[PDB]
From a paper:
Enzymatic degradation of PET using suitable hydrolases, like the leaf branch compost cutinase (LCC) variant ICCG, offers potential for PET recycling under relatively mild reaction conditions. Computer-aided enzyme engineering performed by Tournier et al. introduced an Ile at LCC position F243 to enhance the enzyme’s catalytic activity by further expanding the substrate-binding site. Additionally, thermostability was increased to 94 °C by disulfide bond formation between D238C and S283C in combination with mutation Y127G. In this study, ICCG was utilized for the application of a crystal contact engineering strategy to increase crystallizability and test the rationality of the applied approach.
Out of seven mutated surface positions (L32, L50, S111, S194, A206, S207, and I209) for introducing an aromatic π-π interaction (Tyr, Trp, Phe), IMAC-purified ICCG mutant L50Y (named ICCGY subsequently), successfully crystallized in µL batch experiments with the established HTP conditions tested (0.8 M succinic acid at pH 7.0; 1.0 M succinic acid, 1% (w/v) PEG 2000, 0.1 M HEPES at pH 7.0). In addition to the successful implementation of batch crystallization for ICCGY, the nucleation window for this mutant is broadened to varying concentrations of succinic acid and PEG 2000, as depicted in Figure 2. Molecular structure analysis revealed a change in the crystal system for ICCG (space group I222) and ICCGY (space group P41212). The change in the crystal system of ICCG(Y) from I222 to P41212 is associated with a denser-packed ICCGY crystal structure, resulting in smaller crystal channels. Also, the two space groups are formed by varying crystal contacts, resulting in different neighboring amino acids for L50 and L50Y. Although a π-π interaction between L50Y and Y107 was intended, the analysis of the crystal structure of mutant ICCGY indicated an interaction with neighboring R7 (cation-π interaction). As the shift in the space group (I222 to P41212) is linked with the formation of different crystal contacts, no π-π interaction between L50Y and Y107 was established at the ICCGY crystal contact, but presumably an intramolecular cation-π interaction (with R7). Nevertheless, ICCGY was used for crystal contact engineering studies to increase crystallizability, as this mutant crystallized reproducibly in batch crystallization experiments. Nevertheless, this study managed to not only generate singular LCC ICCG crystals for crystallographic purposes but also to implement a reliable experimental setup for reproducibly crystallizing ICCG mutant L50Y (ICCGY) variants, which is essential for applications in downstream processing.
Numbering used by the authors: 2 to 258
């Protein structure tokens, strides 16, 4: 049962470190692509399986290197992950959405044969930090064929996204760049009632929590991607009946349980 199932039965511990798949990397040069600034693809190797794909945007003034740990973490659990660079480090959230859109098309159509061999392009998702997280919300509204969206400490001036794509938002309690009261929480609350949604708030965390190895971000991001991109109900346990001392808030409409 479940053709998209990959990897062993998960434990919490295992989701806080790199997973069972060997990871290859491919550098997408800036000038090689139109529509975004290149980036790095992290993808499984030493395996004959295909996997869902994820495009991920860094935040305002940041490089793809700021999410390298997470691109590799996700790939090692069984995903093809393209972390983009943006045309300009100064690009806003809606520009980042357009670039995510270009990056997804690139992954499907134009990426190296070794990457395409590992990709099931029928199953794609998005994630992003800060302004990249605002871009993640925007693209989830523009393209409801996506399987999931994970905005990390998101920032956007638009607060309402009418998307049917399942969304998990990570807020940071002590974020002064994108305060959760103005950004993450409004975004959560304003998503449709009928859309599966989760909000987790990291205790004592700042806006840069996403930029280094973070156990909570790892567990929640892997679990949401597995649940929605792979239909992998083994990951429900991490997202349901949650009692996590790393969290200082948790909200859900419990559609995923
Ligand atoms: Cl380019």
């Amino acid at each position: 049962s479940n053709p998209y199932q990959r990897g062993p039965n998960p434990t919490r511990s295992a989701l806080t470190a790199d997973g069972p798949f060997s990871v290859a990397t491919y550098t997408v040069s800036r000038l090689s692509v139109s529509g975004f600034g290149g980036g790095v693809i992290y993808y499984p190797t030493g395996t004959s399986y295909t996997f869902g794909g994820i495009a991920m945007s860094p935040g305002y003034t940041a490089d793809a290197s700021s999410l390298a740990w997470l691109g590799r973490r996700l790939a090692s659990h069984g995903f093809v992950v393209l972390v983009i660079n943006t045309n300009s480090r100064f690009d806003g959230p809606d520009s980042r959405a357009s670039q995510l859109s270009a990056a997804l098309n690139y992954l499907r159509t134009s990426s190296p044969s070794a990457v395409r061999a590992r990709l099931d392009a029928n199953r794609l998702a998005v994630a992003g930090h800060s302004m990249g997280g605002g871009g993640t919300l925007r693209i989830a509204e523009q393209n409801p064929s996506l399987k999931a969206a994970v905005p990390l400490t998101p920032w956007h001036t638009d607060k309402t996204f009418n998307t049917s794509v399942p969304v998990l938002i990570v807020g940071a309690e002590a974020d002064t760049v994108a305060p959760v009261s103005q950004h993450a929480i409004p975004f959560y609350q304003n998503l449709p009632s009928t859309t599966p949604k989760v909000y987790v708030e990291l205790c004592n965390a700042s806006h840069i929590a996403p930029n280094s190895n973070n156990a909570a971000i790892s567990v929640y991001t892997i679990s949401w991607m597995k649940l929605w991109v792979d239909n992998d109900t083994r990951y429900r346990q991490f997202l349901c009946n949650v009692n996590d001392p790393a969290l200082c808030d948790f909200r859900t409409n419990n559609r995923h349980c």
